[PDB]
């Protein structure tokens, strides 16, 4: 038997740290896979690295010519890739802060990026409606996918790196075979609101999608069926990341345009907590890989990142 954190009926996340230092809107925050670092990207063209447990500022990574919309870690936590309004991605060596490769090909802003699990590949999506697969070791573009007819808002590899899921303002989610670039599947709903975010579940079987109609949906990937819907927050404008939280119970976590962090019971769809303290739109949230820690970041009128932790929670107790 292994040590697995308790699964309460409702978590109890409390604010522990607030991290100030970006000078413009923060666009994304991500925990390193080894659990030691938190990376943030911002419209001020900077990446900042912070300690995951204490929020202590570690270093600033610079060189992009315009603002950054996304950042993503390699699997060994040694590299980062960023996507910038300057139409490039850059690969960084985290310990030294040096740009190893600039990936150019996109015709407009790069909005989203991710390493594949093996971390020899990078996928990216652009305002230019395309999805690109890049070679990390050489920095050349392997494929360009004619993915969508509007900006691409998110791209993500599944658990074994054989599939990429993409989303776009055109209202579509598509799944691509990495090896061939073939579109294997297009997800369409009764209606086609812009899709502002998508990602695979940790086991690769479901995809979680955000639409600009204040809705999160969990889709069965094989069947192309929507299995769960999550509402109650505000998301009509911004590309707000959403997360699977799995260290404590099984929750969906997302930011919101009403300045709060929302947490849903994955299975029942009920809101189980709303974290208050941010003072502007919560644009990005992320969940620590092993601890019950949530990082949240907010837009220009706030500009801070918050670390929340839940060690306890509500338990149901049968008296008899």
């Amino acid at each position: 038997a292994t040590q697995s954190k308790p699964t309460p009926v409702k978590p109890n996340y409390a604010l522990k740290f607030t991290l100030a230092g970006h000078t413009k809107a923060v666009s994304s925050v991500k925990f390193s896979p080894n659990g030691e670092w938190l990376a943030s990207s911002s419209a001020d063209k900077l990446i900042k690295i912070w300690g995951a447990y204490d929020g202590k500022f570690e270093k600033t990574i610079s060189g992009h010519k315009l603002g950054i919309s996304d950042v993503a870690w390699s699997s060994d936590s040694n590299l980062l890739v960023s996507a910038s309004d300057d139409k490039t991605l850059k690969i960084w060596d985290v310990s030294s802060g040096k740009c190893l490769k600039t990936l150019k090909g996109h015709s407009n802003y790069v909005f989203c990026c991710n390493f594949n699990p093996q971390s020899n590949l990078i996928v990216s999506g652009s305002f230019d409606e395309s999805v690109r697969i890049w070679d990390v070791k050489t920095g050349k573009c392997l494929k360009t996918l004619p993915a969508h007819s509007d900006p691409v808002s998110a791209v993500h590899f599944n658990r074994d790196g054989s599939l990429i899921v993409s989303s776009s303002y055109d209202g579509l989610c598509r799944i691509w075979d990495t090896a061939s670039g073939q579109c294997l599947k297009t997800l369409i709903d009764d209606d086609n609101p812009p899709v502002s975010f998508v990602k695979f579940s940790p086991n690769g079987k479901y995809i979680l999608a955000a639409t600009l109609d204040n809705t999160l949906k969990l889709w069965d990937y094989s069947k192309g069926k929507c299995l769960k819907t999550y509402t109650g927050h505000k998301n009509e404008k911004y590309c707000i990341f959403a997360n699977f939280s799995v260290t404590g119970g099984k929750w969906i976590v997302s930011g919101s345009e009403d300045n709060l962090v929302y947490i849903w019971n994955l299975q029942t769809k009920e809101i189980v907590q709303k974290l208050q303290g941010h003072t502007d739109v919560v644009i990005s949230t992320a969940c620590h890989p092993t601890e019950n820690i949530i990082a949240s970041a907010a837009l220009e009128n706030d500009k801070t990142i918050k670390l929340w932790k839940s060690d306890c929670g509500t338990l149901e107790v049968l008296f008899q």
């Binding site: 579940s201 086991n203 079987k205 969990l218 299995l227 799995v246 099984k250 994955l266």
Partner: peptide, 11 residues
């Protein structure tokens, strides 16, 4: 009803 979604299980 209410089949329990398992999003972490490796099958």
């Amino acid at each position: 009803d209410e089949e329990e979604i398992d999003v972490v299980a490796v099958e």
